[PDB]
RNA sequence: GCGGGAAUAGCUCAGUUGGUAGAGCACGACCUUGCCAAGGUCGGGGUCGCGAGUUCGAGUCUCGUUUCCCGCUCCA
RNA sequence: GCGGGAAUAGCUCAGUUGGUAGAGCACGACCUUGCCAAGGUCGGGGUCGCGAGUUCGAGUCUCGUUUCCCGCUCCA
RNA sequence: GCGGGAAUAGCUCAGUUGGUAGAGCACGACCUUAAGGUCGGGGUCGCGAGUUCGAGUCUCGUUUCCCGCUCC
RNA sequence: GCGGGAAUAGCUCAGUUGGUAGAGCACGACCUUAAGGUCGGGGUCGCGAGUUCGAGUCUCGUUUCCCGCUCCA
């Protein structure tokens, strides 16, 4: 049983029953996702359970900057300071749907959206802070490369 | 002039002059290189039926801390605040007064609205290079920071 | 099973019952071992089943020389031509005793004997002709190093 | 009169050695000790009664000779090549000629070769005679010249 | 932009010297009793990134070009 | 003997323009629900062979010295 | 491994159809003008067995050395 | 989210014990040297409802904007 294609979070999605195992991700979804969509703090995208409005996973994007000091030499080569980036702020899949490949589908939609964004505005890389080791390996397998200074911070270059 | 289009190796930037040399040399030296590195997106309007650039603006993702941000900008916001930086905006002196600067800024602001549908963006932010530049941006809605007086913001009505 | 320490082949040792899996080696023992010991073509040393004359393993030594062309530059540095060597001509273990580590013990006795001999007469290295590739790996594992020309010819320099 | 044979070392004084054959003497002085270290030869010297001045020496090294240069006596029922010990060097300082020192050196060498042939296959001792005096000397002590190379002689070991 | 390093088999690499193409893993087949695991062998796959040059001879030396990596430079 | 190269963690190795040390394997602990083989993580681990010298500052440059390697030379 | 030869005086060798072991050299001595010659001594025929009236000699076995070929 | 403020003429604002809607700037004509002066025009008091004899004013609901704090490992 798969799920729908990603769609912007709205006031109609039921997020109350969402649990990812990571308290920060779940609490963020339930408390601030929609409010931020209104506030311009982030853009959230959800996939729902087949033919429901119950969210099975989500990712959130926001513009960002990384200082040269906290960036790897590869990233900062011939770049302004700070370096322009897009922050993959949140990426979480309900535990009930782990293994069905929802995280990989979400990350794929996110990367595509970041490409489309980069056509219009300067973006050196996508940046994520992995919350767990499972998360780090997830991102490393899908092309991301950990930092040298902060080893749980990963980047993916776009061009 | 032409309608806005991405910078490419084909645009004539060698004779571009805006009165701020930093902007002109930025165009000529880094516009395209940054286009390649993903440090900025530059858009130019040209002298009709030429590849001669008459004006441009550059966009880049960014963030501003709550301390350098106005309270309207940081209201109920994470830290830092996600923004799009109007990194560069210049018009050749040959085209001053025709209202081209406002057209450039407008195209840029629209592009940021379209972007804000896909990614979190609280405001457009610019570092005004002169007092004229600061006044221009204030005339088009921007509001100076309280801390840094040449940093101005323009909020995006979602 | 358990065997005595190595001793010269003689007319008292039962070599008719030797089987090692290698037909050349077994036929060599049975046909030429004792006569060559008499003729000085080789010196053979055997280990027997403690309290038997049944040969469980043997090695045969004989002087030799190798030309600069088949010698590695390490071997030939500042050396006459040919190079003086001692030839590990034969080394085989009876099938009843494989796995008991007897081949390595024999090789150890042989190397010791060559050291004692090099005390009296110039010897640059021990040289052996590996009969199998497994044998080559055995000798490489115990310190031997293949030549550049023939990889089944291996040397061991003496201290 | 001299000491009993002993291995060459950095302590033996060989600069004053003269045997009449310059090749042998220069070999002693230039290569004896280095070859002792390299495993190219094992050298043994007899000294001048409580000195480190060498009066004579012989050098041994393993070797093999092909059947073509072997006498039929040497190759009878033998592999090819034939394993031998090479008496590479044997020389007496002229100051001790006639005293029978060469025979004593050869005898010590032959004994050492017996003791070696106990441990490793050795068909014969082989020497390359440099002069006719030398060839006849080796022939007098039992050696037998080759059929092909007339300056190469063999001595079989019982 | 300046400097340095890299590019050799599907992957990871070795190749000091200017002198016949390499190893481990992967793949096809075979060997060990008929399958076969471990060990071994055979085979496919390389204009040694590409191109030009010196030499009797180039992975090796020379030059041009492509790409990647690492340090520094830098646009608030 | 002439020439070239090397020595950096228990092992195999990187280390840039002279600006205060790193990787893989190995080791101790943890994850794998626990334990266990594989995999992943965290962590500890160096007079950069030795000595001297230059320098504000040495893994880096100079010299000496110990050891090893590669090419050539060479004693039928 | 196959094949062939040798063993007799200190040395080199002879010893036909089986009948006490021969010649030169060498060695000791002598003759005279170191040489040549003469004189003198030494075997038991590698070993063992057998045939024979009788064996250096023939039969068989064996020891040692040598030569050609074979060969890992 | 907690707290505070704003909305009345084109603009800046007043209209406190609740009574046809007020001043300045600005706008049109005119006086004179385009500033000053004179004259003239413009609302329906953010919206809706309620109390009141009567609501710009009081009560409640609501719309938009603004300020301070809070905040997203
Ligand atoms: Ca659930
Ligand atoms: Ca112009
Ligand atoms: Ca058996
Ligand atoms: Ca002298
Ligand atoms: Ca470069
Ligand atoms: Ca590759
Ligand atoms: Ca390489
Ligand atoms: Ca080569
Ligand atoms: Ca078969
Ligand atoms: Ca192949
Ligand atoms: Ca090809
Ligand atoms: Ca090429
Ligand atoms: Ca390639
Ligand atoms: Ca190619
Ligand atoms: Ca040519
Ligand atoms: Ca080549
Ligand atoms: Ca190049
Ligand atoms: Ca080491
Ligand atoms: Ca190194
Ligand atoms: Ca340092
Ligand atoms: Ca020092
Ligand atoms: Ca450094
Ligand atoms: Ca040095
Ligand atoms: Ca015979
Ligand atoms: Ca006799
Ligand atoms: Ca005789
Ligand atoms: Ca005869
Ligand atoms: Ca006479
Ligand atoms: Ca007589
Ligand atoms: Ca007798
Ligand atoms: Ca008779
Ligand atoms: Ca409020
Ligand atoms: Ca109004
Ligand atoms: Ca107003
Ligand atoms: Ca007011
Ligand atoms: Ca009223
Ligand atoms: Ca006016
Ligand atoms: Ca007035
Ligand atoms: Ca109204
Ligand atoms: Ca009423
Ligand atoms: Ca109210």
PDB file of C-alpha atoms in Angstrom, chain A residues 70-158:
ATOM      1  CA  UNK A  70      31.571  26.011   9.132  1.00  0.00           C
ATOM      2  CA  UNK A  71      31.822  24.934   5.455  1.00  0.00           C
ATOM      3  CA  UNK A  72      34.139  22.383   3.872  1.00  0.00           C
ATOM      4  CA  UNK A  73      36.818  23.724   1.563  1.00  0.00           C
ATOM      5  CA  UNK A  74      35.080  21.998  -1.353  1.00  0.00           C
ATOM      6  CA  UNK A  75      31.909  23.970  -0.664  1.00  0.00           C
ATOM      7  CA  UNK A  76      33.551  27.352  -0.107  1.00  0.00           C
ATOM      8  CA  UNK A  77      35.865  27.262  -3.146  1.00  0.00           C
ATOM      9  CA  UNK A  78      35.590  30.642  -4.865  1.00  0.00           C
ATOM     10  CA  UNK A  79      32.330  31.430  -3.029  1.00  0.00           C
ATOM     11  CA  UNK A  80      31.022  34.508  -1.250  1.00  0.00           C
ATOM     12  CA  UNK A  81      30.670  34.560   2.515  1.00  0.00           C
ATOM     13  CA  UNK A  82      28.305  33.347   3.568  1.00  0.00           C
ATOM     14  CA  UNK A  83      27.561  30.534   1.102  1.00  0.00           C
ATOM     15  CA  UNK A  84      23.948  30.402  -0.182  1.00  0.00           C
ATOM     16  CA  UNK A  85      22.138  27.137   0.447  1.00  0.00           C
ATOM     17  CA  UNK A  86      18.753  25.504   0.795  1.00  0.00           C
ATOM     18  CA  UNK A  87      18.109  23.851   4.170  1.00  0.00           C
ATOM     19  CA  UNK A  88      16.342  20.497   4.227  1.00  0.00           C
ATOM     20  CA  UNK A  89      15.052  21.435   7.664  1.00  0.00           C
ATOM     21  CA  UNK A  90      12.914  18.375   8.374  1.00  0.00           C
ATOM     22  CA  UNK A  91      12.550  14.915   6.825  1.00  0.00           C
ATOM     23  CA  UNK A  92      10.527  12.353   8.723  1.00  0.00           C
ATOM     24  CA  UNK A  93       8.522   9.228   7.935  1.00  0.00           C
ATOM     25  CA  UNK A  94       5.987   7.694  10.275  1.00  0.00           C
ATOM     26  CA  UNK A  95       7.384   4.466  11.733  1.00  0.00           C
ATOM     27  CA  UNK A  96       4.318   2.619  10.416  1.00  0.00           C
ATOM     28  CA  UNK A  97       5.596   3.307   6.865  1.00  0.00           C
ATOM     29  CA  UNK A  98       9.339   2.777   7.279  1.00  0.00           C
ATOM     30  CA  UNK A  99      10.732   0.247   4.827  1.00  0.00           C
ATOM     31  CA  UNK A 100       8.146   1.165   2.153  1.00  0.00           C
ATOM     32  CA  UNK A 101      10.639   3.650   0.676  1.00  0.00           C
ATOM     33  CA  UNK A 102       8.743   6.825   1.624  1.00  0.00           C
ATOM     34  CA  UNK A 103      11.817   8.673   2.865  1.00  0.00           C
ATOM     35  CA  UNK A 104      13.619   8.118  -0.438  1.00  0.00           C
ATOM     36  CA  UNK A 105      10.601   9.300  -2.443  1.00  0.00           C
ATOM     37  CA  UNK A 106      10.331  12.388  -0.221  1.00  0.00           C
ATOM     38  CA  UNK A 107      14.026  13.199  -0.550  1.00  0.00           C
ATOM     39  CA  UNK A 108      13.664  12.847  -4.325  1.00  0.00           C
ATOM     40  CA  UNK A 109      10.777  15.316  -4.534  1.00  0.00           C
ATOM     41  CA  UNK A 110      12.735  17.655  -2.253  1.00  0.00           C
ATOM     42  CA  UNK A 111      15.866  17.547  -4.425  1.00  0.00           C
ATOM     43  CA  UNK A 112      13.812  18.203  -7.555  1.00  0.00           C
ATOM     44  CA  UNK A 113      12.116  21.177  -5.895  1.00  0.00           C
ATOM     45  CA  UNK A 114      15.499  22.516  -4.873  1.00  0.00           C
ATOM     46  CA  UNK A 115      16.723  22.209  -8.462  1.00  0.00           C
ATOM     47  CA  UNK A 116      13.745  24.173  -9.744  1.00  0.00           C
ATOM     48  CA  UNK A 117      14.481  26.770  -7.063  1.00  0.00           C
ATOM     49  CA  UNK A 118      18.150  26.954  -8.013  1.00  0.00           C
ATOM     50  CA  UNK A 119      17.210  27.860 -11.588  1.00  0.00           C
ATOM     51  CA  UNK A 120      15.831  31.164 -10.264  1.00  0.00           C
ATOM     52  CA  UNK A 121      18.135  31.897  -7.312  1.00  0.00           C
ATOM     53  CA  UNK A 122      21.680  31.156  -6.221  1.00  0.00           C
ATOM     54  CA  UNK A 123      22.100  27.913  -4.315  1.00  0.00           C
ATOM     55  CA  UNK A 124      25.433  26.214  -3.770  1.00  0.00           C
ATOM     56  CA  UNK A 125      24.075  23.109  -2.030  1.00  0.00           C
ATOM     57  CA  UNK A 126      21.301  21.437  -0.124  1.00  0.00           C
ATOM     58  CA  UNK A 127      22.188  21.119   3.538  1.00  0.00           C
ATOM     59  CA  UNK A 128      20.739  18.798   6.160  1.00  0.00           C
ATOM     60  CA  UNK A 129      21.513  18.065   9.812  1.00  0.00           C
ATOM     61  CA  UNK A 130      21.072  14.345  10.357  1.00  0.00           C
ATOM     62  CA  UNK A 131      19.263  13.630  13.626  1.00  0.00           C
ATOM     63  CA  UNK A 132      20.227   9.938  13.935  1.00  0.00           C
ATOM     64  CA  UNK A 133      22.835   7.610  12.484  1.00  0.00           C
ATOM     65  CA  UNK A 134      20.181   5.876  10.415  1.00  0.00           C
ATOM     66  CA  UNK A 135      19.501   9.335   8.973  1.00  0.00           C
ATOM     67  CA  UNK A 136      23.176   9.996   8.209  1.00  0.00           C
ATOM     68  CA  UNK A 137      23.488   6.707   6.333  1.00  0.00           C
ATOM     69  CA  UNK A 138      20.234   7.455   4.519  1.00  0.00           C
ATOM     70  CA  UNK A 139      21.615  10.742   3.225  1.00  0.00           C
ATOM     71  CA  UNK A 140      25.087   9.355   2.462  1.00  0.00           C
ATOM     72  CA  UNK A 141      23.578   6.598   0.333  1.00  0.00           C
ATOM     73  CA  UNK A 142      21.538   9.148  -1.640  1.00  0.00           C
ATOM     74  CA  UNK A 143      24.595  11.244  -2.546  1.00  0.00           C
ATOM     75  CA  UNK A 144      25.095  13.598   0.394  1.00  0.00           C
ATOM     76  CA  UNK A 145      28.596  14.068   1.830  1.00  0.00           C
ATOM     77  CA  UNK A 146      29.304  14.720   5.512  1.00  0.00           C
ATOM     78  CA  UNK A 147      31.203  17.829   6.642  1.00  0.00           C
ATOM     79  CA  UNK A 148      34.740  17.827   8.094  1.00  0.00           C
ATOM     80  CA  UNK A 149      34.085  20.206  11.020  1.00  0.00           C
ATOM     81  CA  UNK A 150      30.563  19.091  11.966  1.00  0.00           C
ATOM     82  CA  UNK A 151      30.408  15.417  10.939  1.00  0.00           C
ATOM     83  CA  UNK A 152      26.576  15.156  11.261  1.00  0.00           C
ATOM     84  CA  UNK A 153      26.042  18.023   8.790  1.00  0.00           C
ATOM     85  CA  UNK A 154      25.686  16.858   5.193  1.00  0.00           C
ATOM     86  CA  UNK A 155      25.629  18.667   1.858  1.00  0.00           C
ATOM     87  CA  UNK A 156      24.570  17.802  -1.686  1.00  0.00           C
ATOM     88  CA  UNK A 157      25.685  20.013  -4.539  1.00  0.00           C
ATOM     89  CA  UNK A 158      23.102  20.861  -7.152  1.00  0.00           C
TER      90      UNK A 158
END
